[PDB]
Design a protein around this nucleic acid. Structure first.
Lengths: 131, 263, 182, 177
RNA sequence: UACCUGGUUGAUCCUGCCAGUAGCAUAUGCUUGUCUCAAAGAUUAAGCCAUGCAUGUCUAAGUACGCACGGCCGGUACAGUGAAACUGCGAAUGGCUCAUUAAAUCAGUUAUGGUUCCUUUGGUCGCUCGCUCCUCUCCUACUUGGAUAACUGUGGUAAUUC
RNA sequence: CCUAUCAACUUUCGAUGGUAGUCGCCGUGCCUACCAUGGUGACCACGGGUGACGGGGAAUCAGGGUUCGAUUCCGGAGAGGGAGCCUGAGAAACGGCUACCACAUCCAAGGAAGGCAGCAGGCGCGCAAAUUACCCACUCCCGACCCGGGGAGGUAGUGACG
RNA sequence: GGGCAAGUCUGGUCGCAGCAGCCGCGGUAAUUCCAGCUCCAAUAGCGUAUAUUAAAGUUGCUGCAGUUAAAAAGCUCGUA
């Protein structure tokens, strides 16, 4: 309600091929209408199919009233997927990170040490221990 | 045990003229080795995402360097932290924007769009003129660009309009009295103006008495004096903060002005 | 990384004349404890000595002027000092209570829905007011000149205009369940 | 504990085994691991004697001479293929390479030959016309930049060296008056 | 905040310390509702350390003969991709800790015209200026030689990154 | 920093100077050949004492002054203690090695494999100190390198330090 | 109990138990106990321990004292 995305400091990021601006939305008494709404709202502002609009920010101002977000209207998803921090991909989930998680990969580094050749045997050397 | 040189560099114990923050990021960009000494140097990533702010994360700036959109000294850069020193143009190859690295009299790097006429040449006050082996004279400037066959009338501290397209030096400007010199370092950083005086001592430690454009006359050594051309003859544009000298009671009259006066 | 105390401790532990004098400023302005006395007491000793040192500086010093004219302006932007006097001799003559009047609490007691300075601290603490587009919850807020021109009902105070929380509803439930018999 | 080139006599010893001695499988640059090593000569102590029939006999061991354990990797160099036939090197490998039919490696067979190194191709002929291009370019670019200064040097002298004749004549006037 | 307060004595004036008196920063006694900040195995053990993990890395560009994967597309070496492996580089730094050292560290200032430096920035790469042409017969330039890893199997090994 | 209930010290072992060369990244009694008897102290040297890492800086005091710097920084020093080698530009590397010396493991008795003052965590000591946490995203780092890896670090936890 | 703010309370205790940094209570009509109550103090802190800084001009550089309270050598020359 009474949202009004105020694109402060608009930056035509030509070398990252995107529309880059600060999202500043207003509220009656409940801050932060949802992010993908703001994407879809910043879509129809720019007519840009908002699944290339990879937003973040969105902290709720005290007293409702306002929320500062941030917008990157990438001019393509290739313009998105070229720049794209993975936690912006995980800001609204359409790509996520590694879930080995992190200790088996550190364990596999202990496996290539022991024999020369056949990483499959060393992947297999890390495969049998699961403790 | 200092068993080799440090291959890491953290923040705030970092140069202040890079205008980094406090411990918000616990590591520094750490510029590479190259043409200039490391404190003179400026990382691209500070100029890219902390001065122009087209990026926000480091792996983008790696890919922006994989975009190869950055030409420093007219030469293709894929370094996020290239050791670029003084009067180094930066050609942002996608926005069509040239910026030459010069210092302010406030004490900050100037995001300074020179004309592309002024981007082909940069003025390097020379570092040495040496008769190399087999009887061959040379000039090598402060960015260590070893150039065979100098000019046959130049001497020390002459400024060469370094052709950034080629190297392979173009015309010079002789080290002359009263030249415009962006005085850099100490309490005289970023000050341009005529020379009007130089003092000599055998051994070391020669001071140079410089009277700038505002009338501040000051004796500051020739190490602080980088000649940028001819007296009352600039060769790029003047940076922000007038590039000469500013007083702080006037600076509040500056800082009150364009905030809430724009848009 | 860096922190500091915002209150102060005198070198005399029991100076009962002072101890009941500190009871006055709490009762005269609506304070929490003697810390709210000692908070402005922590500041005002530095303010007079900063006024003292700039007075003992030689004139036409920018560290006397540009710092001081800021310190002149900083004391006048909040409206505690007036710049019609505007010299270091009078800044030696300011007090605690000039700041206490420029707190948010007394200005609510001076202006608005406060009947008491018990009441005036409550209206900030129970967030009935907006000093800007700002639910402001700090009674020791010390205000500026423009700040005294936008203190309203909050839009989270459902009386005097606001979205209902659960209380005017409860006060409606005092007539719709307190009087509705269920 | 194995046997190597010079563990001399049969008694099991231990040597500071660096990279460059056998009976040793190294683990780090700059690491010299002293390990136990059994003597090059044989008393009785071994579990395995590594032996090689360099010349067979007349009645076959089935496991060694009737059995065949061949191997598959062929020459990835050019001239090994050529020399056995007394065949020349300007007249190339000229297919005899051991291309390896490797079936169901997708769903087809590949037939993969070792991509021969030390082999001049038309790409190498492109690069031989690219390498000493740059070397001959370097001799001329050295020669170009020399002649640019030499004209620039001598034309400056006609203002500089002419001052010498201006000072010899007034030297004799300064000796006069 | 430039302060003192109590205590000698029959009373008094001293000297004069005592003890009260505030700062602190750990240890702690007791108690604690929100919300912002956060020091924390230094003291004592620079003690031993269990365990978890703390420097990896392939570019269109070193070598694809992966037993791989994917294809007819194959031959001159051919694979799209590519584990490995050999090769290129870091691994010295980082973190941690201050035991140590009393002009020693360190700090400020200087100098290497005594010294060495990966990397990067820039020049330098036809030649023997022809042995007064082996470099025209020295005829290997369309390119050299052999020699290993991965691969394989034989394996031995209480145990081993054997 | 402390000490004269430390007044003289330094070389038989070069202590100090030269010359000469050796060697070392190189200056150098570096080193010896050789020569000289130097060199230096009451201005407290020489020596001994200091949890003496030092400093950037820190707390307090009207001022004058007084206490701190293991401690988010800089520089130094060690990774159990020494020694010796190695690698590379840079390491006597203890997340190298070699051996020793003091510790710790498997042992099937042959041998094999080990040093958290890395993150933690553990015990130990104490008055006294938290995850055996999560993530390589942020920060950076190394690479052949955008790619990756990282207990660096980030992240929260612990957490009336404050 | 004073210093030290606020109990010449109420009860008990009776030089006991305790308290009390110090000065001090308690030996029966306890303002020092032990409690009640009341009050004061600060306050999500407050109190203790130890440490150190001031107060302390009791280390006195500013700026100590040396006839009799501490402190002019037995006296003189006399170098640093």
């Amino acid at each position: 309600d009474t949202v009004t995305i105020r694109t402060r400091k608009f930056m035509t990021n030509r070398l990252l091929q995107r529309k880059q601006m600060v999202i500043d939305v207003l509220h009656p008494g409940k801050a932060t209408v949802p992010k993908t709404e703001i994407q879809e709202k910043l879509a129809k502002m720019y007519k840009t199919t908002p699944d290339v609009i990879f937003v973040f920010g969105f902290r709720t101002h005290f007293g409702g009233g306002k929320t500062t977000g941030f917008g990157m209207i990438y001019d393509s998803l290739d313009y998105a997927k070229k720049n794209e921090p993975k936690h912006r991909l995980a800001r609204h989930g359409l790509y996520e990170k590694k879930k080995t998680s992190r200790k088996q990969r550190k364990e596999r580094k202990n496996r290539m040490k022991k024999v020369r050749g056949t990483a499959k045997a060393n992947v297999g050397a890390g495969k049998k221990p699961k403790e | 045990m200092a068993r080799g040189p440090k291959k890491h560099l953290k923040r705030v114990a970092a140069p202040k003229h890079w205008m980094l923050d406090k411990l918000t990021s616990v590591f520094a960009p750490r510029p590479s080795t190259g043409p200039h000494k490391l404190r003179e140097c400026l990382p691209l990533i500070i100029f890219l995402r902390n001065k122009l702010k087209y990026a926000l994360t480091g792996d983008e700036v790696k890919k922006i360097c994989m975009q190869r959109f950055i030409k420093i000294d007219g030469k293709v850069r894929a370094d996020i932290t290239y050791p670029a020193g003084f009067m180094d143009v930066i050609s942002i190859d996608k926005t069509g924007e040239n910026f030459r690295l010069i210092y302010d009299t406030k004490g900050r790097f100037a995001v300074h769009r020179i004309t592309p006429e002024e981007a082909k040449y940069k003025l390097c006050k020379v570092r040495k003129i040496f008769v190399g082996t087999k009887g061959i004279p040379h000039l090598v400037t402060h960015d260590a660009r070893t150039i065979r066959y100098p000019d046959p009338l130049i001497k020390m501290n002459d400024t060469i309009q370094i052709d950034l397209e080629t190297g392979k030096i173009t015309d010079f400007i002789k080290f002359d009295t009263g030249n415009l010199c962006m005085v850099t370092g100490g309490a005289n950083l970023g000050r341009i103006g005529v020379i009007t005086n130089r003092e000599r001592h055998p051994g070391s430690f020669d001071v140079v008495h410089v009277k700038d454009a505002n009338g501040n006359s000051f004796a500051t050594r020739l190490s602080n004096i980088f000649v940028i051309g001819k007296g009352n003859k600039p060769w790029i544009s003047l940076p922000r903060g007038k590039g000469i000298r500013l007083t702080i009671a006037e600076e509040r009259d500056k800082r009150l002005a364009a905030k809430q006066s724009s848009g | 990384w860096v922190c500091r105390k915002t209150y102060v401790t005198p070198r005399r532990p029991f100076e009962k004349s002072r101890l009941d004098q500190e009871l006055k400023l709490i009762g005269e302005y609506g304070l929490r404890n003697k810390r709210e006395v000692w908070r402005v007491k922590f500041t005002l000793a530095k303010i007079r000595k900063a006024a003292r040192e700039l007075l003992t500086l030689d004139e036409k010093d920018p560290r006397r002027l540009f710092e001081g004219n800021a310190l002149l302006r900083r004391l006048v932007r909040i409206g505690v000092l007036d710049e019609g006097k505007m010299k270091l001799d009078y800044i030696l003559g300011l007090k605690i209570e000039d700041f206490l009047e420029r707190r948010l609490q007394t200005q609510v007691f001076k202006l608005g829905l406060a009947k008491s300075i018990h009441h005036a601290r409550v209206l900030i603490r129970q967030r009935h007011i907006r000093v800007r587009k700002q639910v402001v919850n700090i009674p020791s807020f010390i205000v500026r000149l423009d700040s005294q021109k936008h203190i309203d009902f909050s839009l989270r105070s459902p009386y005097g205009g606001g979205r209902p929380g659960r209380v005017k509803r409860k006060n409606a439930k005092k007539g719709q369940g307190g009087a509705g018999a269920g | 504990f194995p046997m190597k080139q010079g563990v001399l006599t049969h008694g099991r010893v231990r040597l500071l085994l660096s990279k460059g001695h056998s009976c040793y499988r190294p683990r780090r640059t700059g690491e010299r691991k002293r390990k136990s090593v059994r003597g090059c000569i044989v008393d009785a102590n071994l579990s395995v004697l590594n032996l090689v029939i360099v010349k067979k006999g007349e009645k076959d061991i089935p496991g060694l001479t009737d059995t065949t354990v061949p191997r598959r990797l062929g020459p990835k160099r050019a001239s090994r293929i050529r020399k056995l036939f007394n065949l020349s090197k300007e007249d190339d490998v000229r297919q005899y390479v051991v291309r390896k039919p490797l079936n169901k490696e997708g769903k087809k067979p590949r037939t993969k030959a070792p991509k021969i190194q030390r082999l001049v191709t038309p790409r190498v002929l492109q690069h031989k016309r690219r390498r000493i291009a740059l070397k001959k370019q370097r001799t001329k670019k050295n020669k170009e930049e020399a002649a640019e200064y030499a004209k620039l040097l001598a034309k400056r002298m006609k203002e500089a060296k002419e001052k010498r004749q201006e000072q010899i004549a007034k030297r004799r006037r300064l000796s006069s008056l």
